[PDB]
Amino acid sequence: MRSIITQICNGVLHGQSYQSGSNDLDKGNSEIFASSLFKDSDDKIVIGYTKDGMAFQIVVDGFYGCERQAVFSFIDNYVLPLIDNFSLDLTRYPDSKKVTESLIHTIYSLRSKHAPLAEFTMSLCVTYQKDEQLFCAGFGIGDTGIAIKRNEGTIEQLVCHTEVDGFKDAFDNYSSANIDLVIERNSVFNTKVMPGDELVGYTYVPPMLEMTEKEFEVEIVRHLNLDPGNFDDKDPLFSQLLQVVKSKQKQLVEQAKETGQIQRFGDDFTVGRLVIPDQLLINQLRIHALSIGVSDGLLSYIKNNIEKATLYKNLIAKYQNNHFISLIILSALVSDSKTPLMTQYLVGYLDFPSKALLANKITELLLKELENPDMREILGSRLATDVIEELETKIIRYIDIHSTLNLWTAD
């Protein structure tokens, strides 16, 4: 009962490339890229934010272009609702290793009884905030990989490309009995993160750019990172990454001319970029989590006192891009004692035990938006404590506030 994701790359790409959507909701921080590296895409990358506003990125590369769709419908229907339970257990339980294996276990048990035909390699990272500082923790099994760039010009390597002596440990039925072995040889992590750190996820690279980090044995495995020596500290990682692969691609195809006729190599190249958000962006993300979830519920119940909410849906659909007004509109709906069913139904749709606990949640996120430097510019020496109550009175006029409201969206 929610919509969280922001940008996705599904089983599709345009001619030779597919870039992005640059979702406003991420304020220019959600970008991905996809290309073919030999005609169709098999990989899938997902970047989004929790209902509590925590950042995450999922990277998938499939095996067979024949199934290629239940792999995706597996992620969209069952894996996505698991992210909230991941970041929460990361916040509640300190032990990063325990829940991650259970998550993989829950993934394996779920992938068996719902779509065991799916064989892919997946990697993911999710952010969580237990203390004042931000933490991110995830794993990755297969030919995939995640990298990070910090605030100092360091390309630190998160989840690595695991190679089992020339075997790609993956989410296949074949490994579904050697599960516990897959974890000890694959990469799981939990690392401290600061705002502005650049999270980069990738699927395939020509091996000329990969450098071997770790080799060991179990009763041989290669844990290998992305070589940072050919990268700079001034430019972002994602934009710099494509500057070299195309530069090496033309160098690789030129190598492919001197061999009679066509040679064969290359995989689906899909790359995702994520930037860790600030404490301000989280709140207005936490704001957007409610605005999306509140609308759709009572629209099918009544479909089988509605005239307001249909106009309310359009009203939020007009001012959802500004996170401040989108908040205060909600405060009026709960205060309307003449719309109790429309008020009381939402918490049931949202699983809230008490309406009042929600009403506290409104004000807490409301007042912190005053710490956003944009509202101090718009709200100056105006005893805001009363104005919200005034604004609460303003919205109850159901029957031309937009110009009066346009005072607060003047950016």
Author numbering: 37 to 74, 88 to 268, 279 to 363, 383 to 477, 484 to 495
Sentences from the paper on this structure:
While SidM catalyzes the attachment of adenosine monophosphate (AMP) to Rab1, SidD catalyzes AMP removal from Rab1, a process known as deAMPylation. Inactivation and removal of Rab1 is initiated upon translocation of the effector SidD which deAMPylates Rab1, thereby priming it for inactivation by the L. pneumophila GAP LepB and causing its gradual removal from the LCV 4–6 hours after bacterial uptake. SidD is a protein of 507 amino acids with no significant sequence homology to other entries in the database. Taken together, our data revealed that the CTD mediates localization of SidD to membranes using a dual-binding mode that combines a general membrane-binding determinant in form of the loopCTD with a specificity determinant represented by a helix-turn-helix unit at the C-terminus.
Crystals that diffracted to 3.6 Å were obtained with a slightly truncated variant comprised of residues 37–507 (SidD37-507). Residues 85–88, 269–276, 365–382 and 495–507 were not well-defined in the electron density map and could not be modeled. The six SidD37-507 molecules present in the asymmetric unit displayed identical structures with an L-like shape formed by two domains in nearly perpendicular orientation. The N-terminal deAMPylase domain possesses a protein phosphatase fold, while the CTD is formed by a bundle of anti-parallel alpha-helices with no apparent similarity to known structures. The two domains are connected via a flexible linker and are positioned almost perpendicular to each other in the crystal lattice. The ab initio molecular envelope calculated from the SAXS data revealed a similar L-shaped structure but with a maximum diameter Dmax of 115 Å, which differed from the calculated value of 89.2 Å for the crystal structure. Indeed, the SidD37-507 crystallographic structure exhibited a low fit with the observed solution scattering curve (χ2 = 2.48) supporting the hypothesis of interdomain flexibility. Our SAXS analyses subsequently revealed a relative mobility between the two domains, with 76% of the particles existing as L-shaped molecules in solution while the other 24% of the particles assumed a more extended morphology. Upon closer examination of the CTD sequence, we noticed a stretch of hydrophobic residues between helices α7 and α8 (370-FLGIYGFFT-378; loopCTD) that was unstructured in the crystal structure of SidD37-507, indicative of intrinsic flexibility, and that could constitute a potential membrane anchor for SidD. Having a high degree of flexibility between the catalytic domain and the localization domain could increase the sampling radius of membrane bound SidD from a two-dimensional plane to a three-dimensional space.
